[PDB]
Design a protein around this ligand. Structure first.
Ligand SMILES: O/N=C/c1cccc[n+]1CCCCCCC[n+]1ccccc1/C=N/O
Ligand SMILES: O/N=C/c1cccc[n+]1CCCCCCC[n+]1ccccc1/C=N/O
Ligand SMILES: *[C@@H]1O[C@H](CO)[C@@H](O)[C@H](O)[C@H]1NC(C)=O
Lengths: 535, 533
């Protein structure tokens, strides 16, 4: 300190941080990257709730992204942008409990609404340091304070021997909560308003966000929530205590390991070993199932997310939820026979029926037939293009769209201001094939305003659209309302209500209000399927 | 005496009556006996062929209507009464009516044999909507309709018994068919071109004939309007017929022989008095005495027969009306009435589904409910009402038809399907029932050509089109006009394309998929849901 840039020095509760002046298209932003918010969850601290980071001495360099939490690294399509863009971009380490803060540069005069991003990655992957989560644009363009944190994923985050001390489960959520606690404490040092914290997150991040909505100790830590393509309810975002126990003990078996003995043994297992084996504990051949996810421990989650959304009072909550046009497509290439990124993935009826089983792994034969019969276009039951798309839809609807519809409804029904969107714009830069439509996760780069970066080769329409979305997200963070309070000429985004079930199309075209989030089909999944499973 | 009105049939001479149809005379021979009156000991028995008679049998007026329940829900309401018996009720009713052109056809003219509906509990070939003169006059069709026994008299089965083997109303029909085969030539009818057509229970009956081998030699083409031998109401199992017959018999104070013998001692109205009361559940579109799967007339269930049948040289015209289900709702589904708009509650809808799909488990019913709810307007009465209509119409007609169509198409039949979407301007039922069950018949029969009936000009032209389809179909097995070029063409229904046409005032529109998604629910899913309780 002396010749350092004065705007980049900030003190948080744990000590002094030197951030970095990042170049955003419209000008500088302040980034404090790699701020530790927890004690490294290593050694005996593996599977343990995060312990808050102990203060450090001197100026913690916060100029680079810290380690990515240990995770399975997708090698399905090696060096393909569409996969690699989601892969860890820093070293894998269990010492990964860091968070990142972008703020305008200079730091906002007045306390600025804070956006906390919680990445997705199925609870087994992700990193706040991914290019698509770059907060610089929101910071620069929207003046937003954007916080993203690493949280433990995979076994490290979610292995649970529920009821135990040494592996209570949901610790990755606890990381997240800790990072939320951090923002509450420290964000004002960046000119973030701790009294205006909006969680947003996509997929597992969305699920994690929803789980903070649903978990009391989290509720005082944020004020608004965006759930993108993910919900805490649904068939993948959680597992029962029983099932978590089952998976944790199985994983233990797989790697060579009463609860203490078993965790202690897992704790001696090298990180990579856990990762190499985590996939191998899933109960069925499945897609959109992840081995180590939030567990309904009766603690973080006092009950199933279903029970909590169906009964919780969400009076004081503004939630923005939504989906991409093709939530299922992405998943199909990871295990549904017949699907590939490299061809049209036109499938047979057989491959559809088979895919339905994999995509709805919990489905009894009856349920699977129901699904199939529902998604078959009986006018062309054999049309492979339809079958391919129905397969996408099955997976998408079941895991995201219908969980989301359910969430939007349950929330709306119980006091939330809910805004619902479907995001229908295929990035011009998508490397996933056309058939995959707008896959799960490809709205993120737009919410984050990556298209503002002219080096990134988006169309100017996409630049404008990204700007629109950032406006929505940040208006929402600011006010609880995505609508521009000044730009009345623009079409309006009405809240989603149980009566009207209004949601907007997010595309290049101006906002189109649509009714009923895939209402017929979601009645199938949210109302009928349960009953079919339960008999 | 008018020589054109004198016909020697097998059993003797008949005097018909020259009737006036708007375009000129038709010879009508009404009330021709084709069976021994199925009276006394012959109650519940297969019809025996009518003994020859001396002299000239007066066939100038309709004979009695088979003994049947008379609908009295809306007394003196054109909408209900038009289906009520218009001749004396009698067990002695086994008579058929032939309309022919006047003068009678120079050459063997295709025959249309109409088999009325009435849920197998009612009907009469003598109803005004079955007036064959128009088809006779305009299309030069020889049209035949028979009374067949309904209700207990036609379908009270004690399966495996000698004295009530069941399906006798269908045998009555078969006998009328045989009669046509043996006699229609005398009227100018071509026994080598006999098209059965029927609507609803009639259509199911026609279906039965398709599905029953002895019947197969008595017709070449079939038209099933709003009814099918398959589906939830057209048939009962043997065990169920037995249970209902023995229930009825219990209800009227009655070993098969003795049970039937006692039933035979019972005034007709005593049987009809208790007819309704033997249905297993609070039903609509379910009838107590229907064709039974006896392993005889029906060697298996219609399902099995349509699934496995050979229909290579069969032509079948099948269709439905826009609102197959509305009509039935007024008859037991709470919240529904012809007088108010029948805007029902959700509760009333759930309750109506248990009544509309009486065979449904809770889960099955929930599945129906979840399927037919507009989740966008879930509590909307207009929607719930219309969905109720739809539930009933689809379960009972549309999806059975779609399935019949598909199984026949697949099994090598030539199939033309339609949906009839034009509401008679003269319909007395409320608008919300749209195009109810049976209100195409008047058009097919050409009643709008009767300018006294006050149909619109458009409807006269339309009835003309429909008579052309039906008789063209009768003539050729193809409802398309081999004279007309672009009309456009009514394509065969096939399992692949599932093409059917809208019969309405607009020209034919070819559509694909007869409620395909919904019928998959009904025909493919719902059964699995019962096949697992
Ligand atoms: O062979 N599987 C190995 C394994 C091991 C341990 C955990 C998970 N797996 C599979 C991954 C499945 C889901 C693949 C999803 C990859 N993905 C990454 C970023 C953004 C989206 C997606 C998928 N969207 O469908
Ligand atoms: O109240 N019912 C007493 C009863 C008694 C003994 C046998 C049957 N029932 C039910 C008859 C109702 C259904 C009336 C249907 C009227 N209908 C007549 C001709 C053609 C079509 C229809 C109705 N279509 O919905
Ligand atoms: C995008 O296009 C530019 C300019 O034509 C080119 O130099 C570059 O290789 C491309 N890079 C990306 C990020 O797509």
């Amino acid at each position: 300190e002396g010749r350092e840039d004065p705007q980049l020095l900030v003190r948080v509760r744990g000590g002094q941080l030197r951030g970095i002046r990042l170049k955003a298209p419209g000008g500088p932003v302040s980034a404090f990257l790699g701020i530790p918010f927890a004690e490294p969850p290593v050694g005996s601290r593996r599977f343990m709730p995060p312990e808050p980071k102990r203060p450090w001495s001197g100026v913690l360099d916060a100029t680079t992204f810290q380690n990515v939490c240990y995770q399975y690294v997708d090698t399905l399509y090696p060096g393909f942008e569409g996969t690699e863009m989601w892969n860890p971009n820093r070293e894998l380490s269990e010492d990964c409990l860091y968070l990142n803060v972008w703020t305008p540069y200079p730091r906002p005069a007045s306390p600025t609404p804070v956006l906390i991003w919680i990445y997705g990655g199925g609870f087994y992957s992700g990193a706040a340091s991914l290019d698509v989560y770059d907060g610089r644009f929101l910071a620069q363009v929207e003046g937003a304070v954007l916080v993203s944190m690493n949280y433990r994923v995979g076994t490290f985050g979610f292995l649970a021997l529920p009821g135990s001390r040494e592996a209570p489960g949901n610790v990755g959520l606890l990381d997240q909560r800790l990072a939320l606690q951090w923002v509450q404490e420290n964000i004002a040092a960046f000119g973030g308003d701790p009294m205006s914290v909006t969680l947003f997150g996509e997929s597992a991040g969305a699920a994690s966000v929803g789980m903070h909505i649903l978990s009391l100790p989290s509720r005082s830590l944020f004020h608004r929530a965006v759930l993108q393509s993910g919900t805490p309810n649904g068939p993948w975002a959680t597992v029962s205590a029983g099932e978590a126990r089952r998976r944790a003990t199985l994983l233990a078996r797989l790697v060579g390991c009463n609860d203490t003995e078993l965790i202690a043994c897992l704790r001696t297992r090298p990180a990579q070993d856990l990762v190499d084996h985590e996939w191998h504990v899933l109960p069925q051949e499945s897609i959109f199932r992840f081995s180590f996810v939030p567990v309904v421990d009766g603690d973080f989650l006092s009950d199933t997310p279903e029970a909590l959304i169906n009964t919780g009072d969400f009076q004081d909550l503004q939630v923005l939820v939504g989906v991409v046009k093709d939530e299922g497509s992405y998943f199909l290439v990871y295990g549904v026979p017949g699907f590939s990124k490299d061809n049209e993935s036109l499938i047979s009826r057989a491959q559809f029926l088979a895919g339905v089983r994999i995509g709805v792994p919990q489905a009894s034969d009856l349920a699977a037939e129901a699904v199939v019969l529902h998604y078959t276009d009986w006018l062309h039951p054999e049309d492979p293009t339809h079958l391919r798309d129905a397969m996408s839809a099955v997976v998408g609807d079941h895991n995201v769209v219908c969980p989301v519809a359910q969430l939007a409804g349950r929330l709306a029904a119980q006091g939330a201001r809910v805004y619902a969107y479907i995001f229908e714009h295929r990035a011009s830069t998508l490397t996933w094939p056309l058939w995959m439509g707008v896959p799960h996760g490809y709205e993120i780069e737009f919410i984050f305003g990556l298209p503002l970066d002219p080096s990134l080769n988006y169309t100017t329409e996409e630049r404008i659209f990204a700007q629109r979305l950032m406006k929505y997200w940040t208006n929402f963070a600011r006010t609880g309302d995505p609508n521009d309070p000044r730009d009345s000429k623009s079409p309006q985004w009405p809240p989603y209500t149980t009566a009207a079930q209004q949601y907007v199309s997010l595309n290049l075209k101006p906002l189109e209000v649509r009714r009923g989030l895939r209402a017929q089909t979601c009645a199938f999944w949210n109302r009928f399927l349960p009953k079919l499973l339960s008999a």
